[PDB]
From a paper:
Protein translation relies on aminoacyl-tRNA synthetases (aaRSs) to charge tRNAs with their cognate amino acids. Plasmodium AspRS is a Class IIb aaRS that exhibits unusual sequence features compared with human AspRS, including initiation from an internal methionine, and an insert in the anticodon-binding domain. PvAspRS (96–631) was successfully crystallized as the apo protein, in complex with the natural intermediate, and with synthetic Asp-AMS and Asp-DACM, allowing insights into the binding determinants. As anticipated, PvAspRS adopts a dimeric structure with features typical of Type II aaRSs.
We solved the structure of apo PvAspRS and refined it to 2.1 Å resolution. In apo PvAspRS, residues SEGG of the Chain A flipping loop are not resolved. In Chain B, the flipping loop can be built. The SEGG loop interacts with a conserved residue Q371, as well as S350, N356 and A357. B-factor analysis suggests the SEGG loop is more mobile than neighboring regions of the protein. By contrast, in the equivalent region of apo PvAspRS (L347-Q371), the flipping loop and flanking β-hairpin are both well-defined in Chain B, while in apo Chain A, only the flipping loop itself is not resolved. By contrast, in apo PvAspRS, the equivalent region (R396-H405) is ordered. Interestingly, only minor shifts are observed after binding of ligands suggesting that the apo PvAspRS chain B flipping loop is poised to adopt a closed position. Thus, differences in the sequences of PvAspRS and EcAspRS in this region likely underpin the observed structural differences, enabling the apo PvAspRS chain B flipping loop to adopt a conformation that is poised to form a “closed” structure.
Numbering used by the authors:
A (entry chain A): 98 to 149, 179 to 350, 355 to 631
B (entry chain B): 100 to 132, 135 to 149, 179 to 631
The structure:
Amino acid sequence: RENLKNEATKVLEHVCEDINKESYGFVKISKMKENEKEIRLFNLEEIYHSLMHLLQSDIWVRGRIHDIRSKGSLAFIILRHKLYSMQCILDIKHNDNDKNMMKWVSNLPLESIVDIKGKLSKPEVPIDSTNIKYEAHIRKIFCISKTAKELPFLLKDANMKETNEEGSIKVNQDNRLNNRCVDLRTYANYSIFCLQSQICTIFKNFLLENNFIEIHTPKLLGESANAFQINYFNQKGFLAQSPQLYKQMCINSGFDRVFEVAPVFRAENSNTYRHLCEYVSLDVEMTYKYDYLENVHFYDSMFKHIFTELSKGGKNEMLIKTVKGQYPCEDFQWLEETPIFTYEEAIKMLIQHGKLHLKEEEILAYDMSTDMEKELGKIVKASHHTDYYIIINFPSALRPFYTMYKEDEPAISNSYDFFMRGEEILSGSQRISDVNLLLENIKRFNLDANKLNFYIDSFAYSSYPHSGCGIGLERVLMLFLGLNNIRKTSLFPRDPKRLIP
Amino acid sequence: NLKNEATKVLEHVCEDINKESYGFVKISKMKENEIRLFNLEEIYHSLMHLLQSDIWVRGRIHDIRSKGSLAFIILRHKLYSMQCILDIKHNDNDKNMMKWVSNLPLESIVDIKGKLSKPEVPIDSTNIKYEAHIRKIFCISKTAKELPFLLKDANMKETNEEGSIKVNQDNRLNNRCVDLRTYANYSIFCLQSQICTIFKNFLLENNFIEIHTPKLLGESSEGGANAFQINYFNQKGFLAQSPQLYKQMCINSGFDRVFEVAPVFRAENSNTYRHLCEYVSLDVEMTYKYDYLENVHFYDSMFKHIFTELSKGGKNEMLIKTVKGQYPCEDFQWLEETPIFTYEEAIKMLIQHGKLHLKEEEILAYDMSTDMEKELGKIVKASHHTDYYIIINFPSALRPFYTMYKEDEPAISNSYDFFMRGEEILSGSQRISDVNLLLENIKRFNLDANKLNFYIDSFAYSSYPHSGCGIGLERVLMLFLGLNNIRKTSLFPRDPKRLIP
């Protein structure tokens, strides 16, 4: 006798043809018509916000099967949607003792998408793991999308705060990035990329509220070292590392205040915890009336506003908490007055704390390393109790050709970097807005003016005094959350060894 | 020879503003014993307080007119202009001042101290109907070079009269930084920013998150023949033509509702009025409950909202009116309820009007050309009195491989194009959300599944029912305003013959 096993297989694979006559099965979306009319379908986010009309009668809810635990005549399903999860209970004493229904439910693979008809109620002791403290008691359950393939790893493992406690399964970065579409379902990763969207929104709205316009400038360039080359119709072209030339040309056109949110591309063969070959740059360029520090304080206000808005309200607080659950770090700290140090002051601080050793002969040409900048971050965290500060007045020889120098001390420039947790997030400067000084500085840097003619020519019919800055988006998010690797805040990271997915 | 003393007046450099009233001045020297500097936009908005005393205003010299003891400067900022008057009688009869002011090149940036008064008959050109009587005027940035063309010529509406004023597209784009100072071009790009803002805020208010996905690909997202190639550290890469694959992977990851505003790159060798090799795509992808038409109506409401917000009073109507002054065109029109045609109906309309000759069994095989789209637009404008409409139910064989076909009538698909002034602006569809059907369709289109495996694998652990769409930003703006060429709505256009600026 083997027809018993084939009948069981029929049960596991059961396709429901009428959801009015049946209580379980795989269903086509077209067949989901209850009493020839539309179903009022809820998602778990609506349920969470309403509860933490849904309690009067049976409701319909869709979600992904996060977990199923079979326990004889009971089965417990965790449904998941975004950051929200809810326990649903199948108890076949309440389902006409249909053993086939239980068998079919127990066989459902994790991550399958189901529509459940059931009644909500609040248990005595609610499940700690679900942030919805109600449970659905299942009357019907239909699967509209069945998981077709064994998962590359378990979400229970991918969600775990990483530990050495015996029996811990780590999912390593390579496996996660290789199966990114599964990795992104962890609660922390979903929350990270909502926070990324939030930073974009806050940035744009702050600038728009201050009378900026958004611009979009080309990434295919006729001229750029550390740039990807392309064949552009038998011309040789390059990918933009920055929209720097075009945003200045817009200021020279009278646009006054511009920003861009757009990809940039870097071809350095660098494999580190923080370098990406492709990332999103937030770029600002704007005029000033008489002092470029007018703009510096503006950019400072911008970041303080970003910090304030990320740390405020229910939604952002929950997103940050959810990240922290898997990746704990102390909350980001900033002051009402942002500390500003000159480069010379920062050097002298590092020498005073015994982190740096230079002759006075060498202090002019010294180019601060990235580790040294982290040491400054530690010093300033200890003395000023902040994770955010500003360095100004870098030596001119260490900054790009378009940086305006001080006319009293030409060796010193009107430049600035902002730091979060000891790492640079923003770089910018007052720009040379005199076409003749600009030509002089381009020759001073041994650059080819013929490859910059269009840019140079935008200064030849007057130029407003202006300044600007460029910001790494993924890096700001990484440093705000204290995450250990830039690949955690870029959706599909690009690095010299990763072109896929 | 007393001409040297006269040239010393023309090239005069002021050295103390307090004790003087004119001259070129470096920005540091601008210390009036601080200065309250106004721009013409602030003045326009306050007047249409500043009138109790003298004020300072900065601007570009758009026009300069001199005779006898009177001098007229039209000062410009963005789309605002104001007439300033130099009368020697109120300036101790200085003639050196008159000579120096009258020698200033057009486009020079000046700081003026003056008194604002409302004249009896204000100038027709200036939209600020107040005049500034010049108590002092200094020049902080002097035009260094003759302009490639006159802004008076570039601003004028084009007549086809022989010998008429006409600034060529070629010249404009080669000198984009001057071209962008015309009132209409400034207004065009403020309006492009407005579209981005309205689009993002509509989606955000509807619970979307913004995503950023890579433009460097290991494999061509679309057909490889129209993709730019690049060397990515010994690998063969391509520039993205669309973020299609990645936004679907995000939906497959549970993001539920996503949009991206980002560049795309396409390598077709076409030189037309509407094709660009690089442009900005507005991309949307989202789930639905039971019927993909839920999403279509949502996309429709999004566009109606954009039109509503563009067409309202205030800032936008001024921007649009300034564009229409040089490039006239009937207001964009749309109905309270958007007309929806099936593809078969649209074709039969074209047949009924004699534009097409097709037997019944040939209609689904016919691929509507861009010219035929415009003819259909004229028919629909005459019959439905609108510039905006929707076509659904395109034939499956004429749509991309990820388009879900109608199961009952497979030659037909659940797909849609939106149209503005008869031209396609939005394209999208219900997506195949079953990994096995997806593989079947990939084989049906003779595509290489190994080149899509990451994308394909994102469907193997369940897939929500979802749809999406792609929208060209520059093209929406062009069709809204009725402009004749896509190069008018891209800041630094890229086409097969233009890589510079």
